[PDB]
Symmetry: C3
Subunit: 188 residues, 3 copies
């Protein structure tokens, strides 16, 4: 009706949907829009609770990054082992989601020939990585690196991994980010 | 082409930074369902921002171009960009008639809320990028894009241009930057 | 084939060399152009598999700081044989491969000539025909290379995409194989 099977997303709310350190400590806002052979991806992160909400590298000098993993089965269905919760990961309907959990999203999965699964004896190429920067609090001198890797997780058919890292000593800085856009080659 | 809202890609000035028609903002918004793919560049053709000289004007380090939209996604006259230049694509030009509705191109208000007393302002309504004056690799300028942070409108796209180098007799005409944002509908 | 995808012009996502930087088939340029109406969404990476740019050593070659890959197109948007990119696997998509026949027209994928004019002797050259990006050798965050993409600035063709790769660090025995970068450009039609 208003079902939008060309967008797979978290809904644009600020309600937590993600575990970095503890259940529901963060909102990963992730929008995957299918433009044929490419997925246009838009991502940001708000940490609402737990250890990563406020970075203080004076008190926690070793706290310099964390990972959010989306693991997908052979149908492109988000697995329970993901950091991202399944509840509100679905095809778009307006500002919400389709009324039923999707069964197939292979059109949204990172291409396995572009981005092969890890295997001994085959060369691992960097083209399964996209680097970006996002900025804590929108401040131009609070960069964090967002490294996105496709299909490098085990125990799944497809994966998107977000590795967040910083090299600056952030003192009482709320971990809530600007947005970044990237694309990747779709499986079909 | 009602999937593209743009300024035709010619060099004819369409924008007021400092004075009438001092610049060409080339802005292309392509609707890929729930996301708008945006491509932007700027040519300053006249007035105070045409040639940057930070020897003469050491405090001249940025400026803003605002697109303000009403509840129908129609560009408001208070915008820096002229309304007569902003329309759905027709070939290398624009539709001959004013659009009535472009809510599908507006930045999503739940993703990017209007400024409100008492409520948390999140940075996800910002995208940072760099563009390069004259295409020169050592003439970066920051283009900060903010969604729905202007007052007196339903929706907004704001381009804040800034630089942290002393540019001497540098023409303010930029490389292109691509970003996306979540659409209202 | 009703699996022909004339909204994707690409190299295929495989690792088979398709590009000459220094010598025949020394690299795989993975380039995917997806038509979203008036804009082409472009995704690019480079693997150098052989020849002088496979392993950078700026101790042995201190002046070696860049190279160029040119795609030159005729009036129909057909890739010219003189390009760095090889013609045989540059085609509209069919699944993970290409349409069975070489395309005759791809003007919808060409960089817009009003946005990005050809070089002319008397004419003001605007920088908006350039996009800058970074990619990272071996996926390592401290091995950046600049990828500068320029539209329609080559002579002897109707359209062009030029990739200028450069770096500003001393890379010692670093394999030139990159992360991916996404950009867009305004389409001719």
């Amino acid at each position: 009706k208003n079902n939008d099977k060309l967008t797979l997303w978290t809904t644009p709310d600020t309600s937590p949907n993600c575990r970095i350190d503890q259940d529901k400590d963060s909102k990963l806002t992730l929008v995957l829009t299918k433009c044929g052979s490419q997925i246009l991806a838009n991502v940001s992160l708000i940490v609402v609770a737990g250890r990563y909400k406020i970075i203080n590298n004076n008190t926690n000098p070793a706290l310099k990054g964390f990972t959010i993993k989306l693991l997908f089965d052979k149908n492109g269905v988000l697995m329970e082992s993901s950091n991202l919760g399944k509840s509100y990961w679905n095809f778009r309907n307006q500002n919400s989601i389709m009324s039923t959990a999707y069964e197939k999203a292979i059109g949204f999965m990172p291409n396995l020939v572009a981005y092969p699964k890890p295997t001994t004896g085959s060369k691992k190429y960097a083209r399964d990585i996209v680097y970006g920067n996002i900025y804590l609090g929108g401040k131009p001198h609070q960069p964090v690196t967002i490294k996105t890797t496709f299909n490098q997780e085990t125990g799944c058919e497809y994966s998107i991994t977000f590795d967040f890292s910083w090299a600056k000593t952030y003192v009482n800085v709320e971990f809530e980010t600007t947005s970044f856009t990237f694309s990747y080659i779709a499986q079909e």
